[PDB]
Structure 1
Amino acid sequence: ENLWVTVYYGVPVWKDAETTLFCASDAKAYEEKHNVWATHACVPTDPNPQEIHLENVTEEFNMWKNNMVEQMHTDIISLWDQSLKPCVKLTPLCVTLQCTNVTNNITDMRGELKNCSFNMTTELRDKKQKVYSLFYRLDVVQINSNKEYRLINCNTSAITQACPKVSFEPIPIHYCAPAGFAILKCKDKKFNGTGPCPSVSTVQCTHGIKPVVSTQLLLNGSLAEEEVMIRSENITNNAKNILVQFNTPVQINCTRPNNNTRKSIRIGPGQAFYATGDIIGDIRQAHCNVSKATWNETLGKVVKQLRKHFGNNTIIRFANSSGGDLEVTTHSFNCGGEFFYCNTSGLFNSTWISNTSNDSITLPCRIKQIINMWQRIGQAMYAPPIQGVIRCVSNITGLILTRDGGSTNSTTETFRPGGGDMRDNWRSELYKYKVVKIEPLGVAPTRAKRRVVGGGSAVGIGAVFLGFLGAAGSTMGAASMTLTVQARNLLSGIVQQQSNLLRAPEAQQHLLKLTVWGIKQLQARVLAVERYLRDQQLLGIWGCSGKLICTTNVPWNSSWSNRNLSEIWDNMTWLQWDKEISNYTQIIYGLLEESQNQQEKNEQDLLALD
């Protein structure tokens, strides 16, 4: 009959918002690895990860607007500049080169390699030295039988050499959310790009994603389950790329058969430049070998799924790269420290329509040493040579295709592989995640009223607890049974020493200082405190300071909701409840803050006033 507003602390209600994630990654060794992705700055995740499965929760997320991809993107780009800044700069190497083609029998072999002698500086300023080196065709340009050649970046951007010690090998890194925030993980095997995920769980940090820069083929990615996925923001719009995920890995073998050598010629005091020396053995091309039976079989899985969107009987052809820079046009990937560039025309020449040797496919791959990752302006990196022969073997788990378009419809459909941006390499793994912030102050009406102003037990074995945020899909009555579950996790580590317990080891952040994740951690730990103390400050004015459930004397207006106590508490989740009261939640917070608890103070002491 008489309903009064009730304050609850720890309700499983969350809202999606963008926050500054930090890092989690297992400690592989005490060590000089100096992995660029992390210098061990990402604090190590607990040996056991806690993942909670939510019952009757249908939370959907949009893969394309997902804010987690851009944060990592800006994260890798910031991480690269932090590794190349301390390395030596090759500003004196921008000198007129005099190149002679490397010793080779010309049958056409059209070797890209050059052999260039240059007047280089030395340890002493007055002295010089005439040293030689080797450079591929892609690194040098002609400046108008040796002729004058110039390094490609000298006219546009400065160049800096990557430290020999740092390794470009991708290692798994997990991204977690700060204290007071949550990450929702879709577990639907047949999950589309955007839409509801019927089975949703929650986790603190995502499973680590190996950051692999790949232009045309995704490498060492997470396999799909059952049928391969064709995720796209709009399959009808050609501008958006078509991301694919494989269920069966396609192994690839890449090598650089040329047995190069490293020559360190001192070019400055304390500074040393690394140049390629004499090449031992036969001059050969860098090639990648992929088995045709497996590629033909997988390609048959992708073409089958594509017909669902465009029709049962339509021409589905595959074509070559239609243009772009050397990055987009070829399968640009890194291996062993160098950067291959493979023409994939042999993989993508096929035609499929309706239904009905065992030798591998070989790919001519070029190699370049001067590169500008992510199309940055004013910057360039010279990768040092890799002594000896190198081999690469990776798994192909996805492709990035494109719609051809054109005026004709339902006549022929061709898909052209492309690598327009590196962000699509992160959407292929962060598709199953979403960042949400949990809000623990949910108000609801109840007939209980404030203890009169004039006025002045089960011991355990509570059953079937659901874990953190497990009661988000249960009824408001059942969800209100577990409030200490959330209140534990609002601040500090959600599980297994998740964050604050971790930042205790010494010299982790001191040595780290402000480099990389060091500033990510301070913003994640300060925001955690600021959100916890905000709710406590909200209680301090609202009464209920030490109480998870408090009832205070405030009338519940009937215009906020016309539903009765039963229907509200019988079959409603706190999530649905926060939606209807969202329009009036601010007003409730104004009446309850002073009229409810400051009128008492003015009357409570007047009562005892002399």
Structure 2
Amino acid sequence: ENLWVTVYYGVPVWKEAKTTLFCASDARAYEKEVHNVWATHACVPTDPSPQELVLGNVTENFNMWKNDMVDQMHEDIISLWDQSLKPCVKLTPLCVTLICSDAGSGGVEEMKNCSFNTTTEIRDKEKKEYALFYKPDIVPLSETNNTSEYRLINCNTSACTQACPKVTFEPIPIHYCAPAGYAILKCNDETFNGTGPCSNVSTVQCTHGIRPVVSTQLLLNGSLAEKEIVIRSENLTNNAKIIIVHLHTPVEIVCTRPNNNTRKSVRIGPGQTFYATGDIIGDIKQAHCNISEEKWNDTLQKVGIELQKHFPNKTIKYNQSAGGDMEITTHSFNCGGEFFYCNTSNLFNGTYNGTYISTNSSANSTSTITLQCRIKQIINMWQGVGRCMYAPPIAGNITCRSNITGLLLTRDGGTNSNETETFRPAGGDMRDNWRSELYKYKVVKIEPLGVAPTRCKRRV
């Protein structure tokens, strides 16, 4: 008639906690005999059988703006980017004054000759060499009106470290897996705002293939949405929170380049050599990118018709960024080991007033949007603690036939009685891409012990 304490093993209860995570990669990336993909060879091989168990009738709170997986992702990418340049060449003796001039043959705009002198195997003798450095990597140091003295940009701040000429910067997928005694709750709701309750939560060992691309403004290769466009924001009231738009129908984007000569090898010490741009064989053409016109138009129209839900009696507008330097105001990414920084002025030129304009013309697919841009070599990413990379050039022509999946916008300062507020592309920190990728998941700790009062009593 009384009650006695009974211990239960295997009780399904959760606790919110933070822990370190594994690494999982496919077995097809281990066949390459050259060490590459920024050291993604030490991960345990994932099983070829993904297990996903759906929970019955439970709800769960979710918050992606205060998450531990995003911070661990950012710290892992920072530390592994800093680790891959340790045995590489240091660009210490390239701080010499560069006697630069325009080439005699042709115009060759956006490049300068910049011939210097460097030490041989003897510390006494020095020999003259030449290269072809890009225009944004060259700073005119000047005490008078001298139009020939130039120096390297990264010899003024820090670092001066070359990338090794054997690794690749391709985005190989990785999976973050919780250890034993931990699980990952994943929300499968199609209308997930980003913060709040979820009614279709499922327990998961670990995630899908996460592509760690490097991008600003627009978002490169990644997972799509499920049903419609989905808009995420922290507060959606202030003008300092970067709003994320997650698309449903991708838009094809390609990028090209002209032809370089080769990687001219210049020796600057015992064993340590660097590869610069030699001559240029062919013509001089701009390095551009192409995006389909009608796909971008009705994609931005769908973004307009669903961004008008939160602003029902207002019209939206688009323009460029509000000024700044090169690295923040331009959509920047990587392809084939070459970095691209391109303005998006022709992509954010429009407005939506609440009226849908259909485009029923199958014979007008010829029109495309072009984006003209330049290429940097000395790289200052992460906005600090970056250990500035000198990317070596690539000999042949390169192509970046890719996929677009998301947009990073930011509101402006809205004046009083305004109904035509504008949205601008945003740069910011690198946490936003992985936060847009790790929205579904939350790490959790299971506790398999419990107590309960029962009618059972042990034998005396």
Q: Please, what TM-score do these two structures have when normalized by structure 1? A: 0.71
Q: Could you say which residue in structure 2 is the equivalent of 1:273?
A: 274
Q: Could you say which residue in structure 2 is the equivalent of 1:73?
A: 74
Higher helix content, 1 or 2: 1
Structure 1's 324 and 10: CA in aligned 2 closer, same or farther, altered over 3 A? farther
Q: 1:249 Cα shift? A: 1.0
Q: Could you say which residue in structure 1 is the equivalent of 2:360?
A: none
Give the SS at the match of 1:12.
Answer: strand
Q: Could you say which residue in structure 1 is the equivalent of 2:161?
A: 160
Matched, 1:408 2:406: no
From 110, 113, 116, give the equivalent of 2:111. 113
Contact 2:182 2:446 in 1 (8 A): yes
Gaps of 5+ in 2: 357-363
Q: 1:13 Cα shift? A: 0.8
Query: How many Å separate the matches in 2 of 1:55 and 1:194?
Result: 21
Query: How many Å separate the matches in 1 of 2:354 and 2:32?
Result: 56
Matched, 1:450 2:458: yes
Query: How many Å separate the matches in 2 of 1:399 and 1:138?
Result: 27
Matches within 5 A, 1:471-510: none
Q: Output the amino acid matched with 1:340.
A: F
Contact 1:102 1:113 in 2 (8 A): no
Query: How many Å separate the matches in 2 of 1:105 and 1:86?
Result: 39
Q: Could you say which residue in structure 1 is the equivalent of 2:359?
A: none
Query: 163-172 or 378-387, which moves further after superposition?
Result: 378-387
Query: How many Å separate the matches in 1 of 2:97 and 2:199?
Result: 64
Alpha-carbon RMSD? 1.7
Query: How many Å separate the matches in 2 of 1:240 and 1:390?
Result: 36
Q: Could you say which residue in structure 1 is the equivalent of 2:352?
A: 352
Matches within 5 A, 1:20-59: 20-28=20-28, 29-59=30-60
Q: Output the amino acid matched with 1:134.
A: L
Contact 1:319 1:414 in 2 (8 A): yes
Q: Output the amino acid matched with 2:374.
A: R
Give the SS at the match of 2:183.
Answer: strand
Number of residue pairs matched by the alignment: 448
Q: CA offsets, 1:91-118, max 9 Å, x none?
A: 0011100111245756xx8x22111110
Matched, 1:375 2:376: no
Matched, 1:149 2:147: no
Q: 1:213 Cα shift? A: 0.7
Q: CA offsets, 1:211-232, max 9 Å, x none?
A: 0010011100111122111011
Q: Output the amino acid matched with 1:336.
A: G
Which structure is larger by alpha-carbon Rg, 1 or 2?
A: 1
Query: How many Å separate the matches in 2 of 1:54 and 1:23?
Result: 25
Paired-residue identity, % = 75
Matches within 5 A, 1:191-210: 191-210=192-211
Matched, 1:244 2:252: no
Structure 1's 43 and 52: CA in aligned 2 closer, same or farther, altered over 3 A? same
Query: How many Å separate the matches in 2 of 1:105 and 1:266?
Result: 28
From 421, 426, 429, give the equivalent of 2:434. 426
Q: 1:60 Cα shift? A: 2.2
Q: Could you say which residue in structure 2 is the equivalent of 1:212?
A: 213
Contact 1:33 1:167 in 2 (8 A): no
Query: How many Å separate the matches in 2 of 1:38 and 1:431?
Result: 26
Q: 1:360 Cα shift? A: 0.8
Q: 1:451 Cα shift? A: 2.1
Structure 1's 154 and 430: CA in aligned 2 closer, same or farther, altered over 3 A? same
Q: 1:70 Cα shift? A: 0.7
Query: How many Å separate the matches in 2 of 1:314 and 1:152?
Result: 46
Q: Could you say which residue in structure 1 is the equivalent of 2:132?
A: 134
Contact 2:17 2:445 in 1 (8 A): yes
Give the SS at the match of 1:226.
Answer: coil
Give the SS at the match of 1:52.
Answer: strand
Gaps of 5+ in 1: 453-610
Structure 1's 345 and 448: CA in aligned 2 closer, same or farther, altered over 3 A? same
Q: CA offsets, 1:114-142, max 9 Å, x none?
A: 11110012233223221100111110101
